[PDB]
């Protein structure tokens, strides 16, 4: 699939394609493929539920999505979803201060962009994540950022990858009420790690800039921080190259 979706405040112009569904506050994707979004949506959620064997690309091509009850992007199931920031385009995602859970015992989603699965953010374009509820970009598996001009403002943690967080490129600017980057998988093999191999990263955080259980690696990157806690909190191993971690 290769679908185009355009929001104009309270109208949606979408291609008719397999598995795609547009409701009042929901664009639901259930088949693999590419989905390109643009325009302003006053109140909505992009919901991805395509199964653990399938992949999708969400191309943000100048979108401005607010959600008054939940996360603007919720990936319920995928093998992997890639988020692509279109060259020269301003993408803004704003979530609610308190999420409403239709099953009031659920606490997921809990991030402005939340994925139960692998997510990769890539591209030359711009992304601003206004995360009022909890975390900014969150996944129960591995978060990867390979590029983009990415600004996160988070009530809790900026980037949260339970499995891992990898940053190999991009211009990333994080403001967090707790940790800038947080990883917590104590369970799985070769998880619980933060790996920064490129890019420019600025972190202002009331607690730690990077908080990881098993490992933090930094090289060939420019990481500048301002923290209330520690620059790097990690009881595991630290492989940090000199001249990469500094103060903001």
DSSP string, 218-244: E-SSEEEEEESS-SEE-SSEEEE-TTS
* Residue (58 or 179) nearer to Gd ion, CB: 179
* Residue (10 or 106) nearer to Gd ion, CB: 106
Token look-up 């859970």 returns 101
Q: How many Å apart are CA 210 and CA 230, to the nearest integer?
A: 8
- 243, two tokens: 């001249």
Token look-up 């980037």 returns 159
- 88, two tokens: 């020269």
Q: Which of residues 11-70 bind Gd ion (CB under 5 A)?
A: none
CB of 113 to Gd ion, least distance (A): 15
**CA 235-236-238 angle, 5° bins:** 105
**Contact between 95 and Gd ion per CB under 5 A:** no
Among the listed residues 30, 124, 200, 226, the single contact to Gd ion using CB under 5 A: 124
Stretch that binds Gd ion, among 5-13, 143-151, 190-198, 240-248 (CB under 5 A): 143-151
- 226, two tokens: 């301002």
Residue 87 assigned as binding residue: no
User: Which residue sits closest to Gd ion, CB atoms considered?
Assistant: 103
* Residue (78 or 240) nearer to Gd ion, CB: 78
Residues paired with residue 58 on neighbouring β-strands, in sequence order? 35, 83
Taking CB under 5 A as the rule, which mask of x and - marks residues 180-219 in contact with Gd ion? ---------------------------xx--x--------
CA distances in angstroms from 218 to 53, 173, 176, 186, listed in the order given: 32, 17, 20, 20
Q: Which residues bind Gd ion (CB under 5 A)?
A: 87, 103, 106, 117-118, 124, 141-142, 147, 179, 207-208, 211
Q: Which residues are annotated as a binding site for Ca(2+)?
A: 116-118, 141-142, 179, 207-208, 211
């Amino acid at each position: 699939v290769n679908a185009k979706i355009v929001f104009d405040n309270d109208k949606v112009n979408a291609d008719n394609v397999d598995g795609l569904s547009v409701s009042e506050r929901e664009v639901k994707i259930t088949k693999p493929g590419m989905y390109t979004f643009s325009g302003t949506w006053n109140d909505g959620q992009i919901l991805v539920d395509i199964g653990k064997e399938f992949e999708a690309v969400l191309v943000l091509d100048g979108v401005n999505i607010t959600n008054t009850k939940s996360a603007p992007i919720y990936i319920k199931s995928a093998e992997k979803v890639k988020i692509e920031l279109a060259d020269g385009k301003d993408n803004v995602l704003t979530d609610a201060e308190f999420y409403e859970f239709e099953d009031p015992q659920d606490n997921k989603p809990n991030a402005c962009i939340y994925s139960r699965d692998d997510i990769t953010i890539k591209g030359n374009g711009n992304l601003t994540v206004n995360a009022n509820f909890n975390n900014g970009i969150g996944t129960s598996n591995d978060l990867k950022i390979t590029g983009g001009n990415i600004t996160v403002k988070a009530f809790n943690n900026g980037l949260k990858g339970n499995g891992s967080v990898t940053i190999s490129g991009g211009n990333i600017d994080i403001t967090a009420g707790a940790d800038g980057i947080k990883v917590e998988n104590t369970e799985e093999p070769h998880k619980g790690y933060v790996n920064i191999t490129g890019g420019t990263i600025k972190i202002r955080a009331k607690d730690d800039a990077i908080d990881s259980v098993r490992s933090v690696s930094i090289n060939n990157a420019d990481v500048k921080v301002s923290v209330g806690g520690k620059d790097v909190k990690c009881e595991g191993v630290l492989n940090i190259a000199e001249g990469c971690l500094g103060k903001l």
